[PDB]
């Protein structure tokens, strides 16, 4: 009928008790279990049978609940903890899993180690060259990047990925990649990554020439 | 202590049909207390259950997979294999076979013990293309960069698998060419430049490609 889980996010900083919902389509008929997904890797299940919980998964994790409602309670959150939570539920010939609790860690603002790398001697003698801007352990996830050839802005020839979550500090990792054909990157000298972070007091810029 | 292992082909092209093997390890697959089923991910989506047998053949699916998903199990072999008929661009996902415990005076109780690694399935017409590692040569930074590669995943290591604190391996990003592109770094101390060596150990199974690029300053 309807498997709801809530919240859908949540940010919380270390240290902090934090409880999650989850409701089952039906009244509880089989085992209600509770999964652990940290990002890439595959699920992890710490409760189990609502209550209990599999040898080897930390005291901090608990869990109770009856009839339709649950709920999923870690006692002292930890940096390896950060997760998308998930609530499984065997009913009719069917296991059906809930929506899912992304939760994340709130930190002290930190500063980025920003890195800027040239393009390869090999990869300029195959016809084309990629130049990155590394952005190295920042929170919060919200920063800009502009890219300036010879003091030029630059759009739409670069792209960027950012990390998931570390589970040691705790922070993003940021990484954008600004490509250019061999013969437009002779053209130019001067290759920029501007640096715009809330945790930036002044907009940090690096660069590099030939 | 049980291990499950996928083995698929990571790229299936459209309306075609997708097969994944599971090889269970540690433990008989004909044990009376445990199902063996198939669970799927879609990119930033949350966990599907396809299907699950037990180790006679008694198979059981997901009403809108039921009409395509047909999951058989070799106890012979030790494993169990899921086949999904008439595959679409939607079933683009992470398959993941996962060890189902049942215990039960009345009837079983279920929880997936274990859980297997992931094959990243992609659906597409497009072709195979392996990769190409580029250094990112320089506490100091330094890394690779894994370019023009399809279809996913690449797994990349750093003086193999020894270096761990500090590396930060970055989503893959498709570019406009259709081809997906990666980039792994690690910072290190600028004292260790000279002295110690670094090596990225990028590997690409889709494709089987396995690249050792030597990471030098200058």
């Known amino acids: 009928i309807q498997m709801t889980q809530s919240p859908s996010s949540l940010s919380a900083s270390v240290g902090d008790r934090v409880t999650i919902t989850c409701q089952a389509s039906?009244?509880?008929?089989?085992?209600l279990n509770w999964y652990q997904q940290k990002p890439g890797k595959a699920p992890k299940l710490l409760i189990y049978?609502?209550?209990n919980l599999k040898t080897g998964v930390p005291s901090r994790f608990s869990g109770s609940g009856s009839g339709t409602d649950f709920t999923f309670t870690i006692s002292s959150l930890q940096p390896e903890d950060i997760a998308t939570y998930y609530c499984?539920?065997?009913?009719?010939?069917?296991?059906?899993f809930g929506p899912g609790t992304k939760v994340d860690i709130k930190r002290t603002v930190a500063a980025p180690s920003v890195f800027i790398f040239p393009p390869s001697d090999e990869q300029l003698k195959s016809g084309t060259a990629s130049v990155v801007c590394l952005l190295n352990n920042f929170y919060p996830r919200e920063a800009k990047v502009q890219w300036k050839v010879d003091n030029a802005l630059q759009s739409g020839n670069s792209q960027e990925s950012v990390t998931e979550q570390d589970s040691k500090d705790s922070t993003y990792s940021l990484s954008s990649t600004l490509t250019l054909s061999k013969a437009d990157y002779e053209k130019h000298k001067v290759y920029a990554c501007e640096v715009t972070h809330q945790g930036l007091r002044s907009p940090v810029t690096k660069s590099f020439n030939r | 202590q049980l291990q499950l292992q996928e083995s698929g082909p990571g790229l299936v092209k459209p309306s075609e049909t997708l097969s994944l093997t599971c090889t269970v390890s540690?433990?008989?697959?004909?044990?009376?207390?445990?199902?063996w089923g198939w669970i799927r991910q879609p990119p930033g989506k949350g966990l599907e259950w396809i299907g699950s047998?037990?180790?006679?053949?008694?198979?059981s699916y997901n009403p809108s997979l039921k009409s395509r998903a047909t999951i058989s199990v070799d106890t012979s072999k030790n494993q169990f294999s899921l086949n999904l008929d008439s595959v679409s661009a939607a079933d683009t996902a992470i398959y993941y076979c996962?060890?189902?415990?049942?215990?039960?005076?009345?009837?079983?109780?279920?929880?997936?013990?274990?859980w297997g690694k992931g094959s990243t399935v992609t659906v597409s017409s497009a072709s195979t293309k392996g990769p190409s590692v580029f250094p990112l040569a320089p506490t100091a930074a330094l890394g690779c960069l894994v370019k023009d590669y399809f279809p996913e995943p690449v797994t990349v290591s750093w003086n193999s698998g020894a270096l761990t604190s500090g590396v930060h391996t970055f989503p893959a990003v498709l570019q406009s060419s259709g081809l997906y592109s990666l980039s792994s770094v690690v910072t290190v101390p600028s004292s260790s430049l000279g002295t110690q060596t670094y090596i990225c150990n990028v590997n690409h199974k889709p494709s089987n490609t396995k690249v050792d690029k030597k990471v030098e300053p200058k």
């Open positions: 996962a060890s189902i415990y049942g215990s039960g005076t009345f009837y079983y109780y279920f929880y997936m013990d274990v």
């Open positions: 540690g433990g008989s697959i004909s044990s009376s207390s445990y199902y």
């Open positions: 047998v037990y180790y006679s053949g008694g198979a």
């Open positions: 039906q009244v509880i008929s089989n085992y």
């Open positions: 049978d609502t209550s």
């Open positions: 499984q539920q065997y009913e009719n010939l069917q296991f059906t």
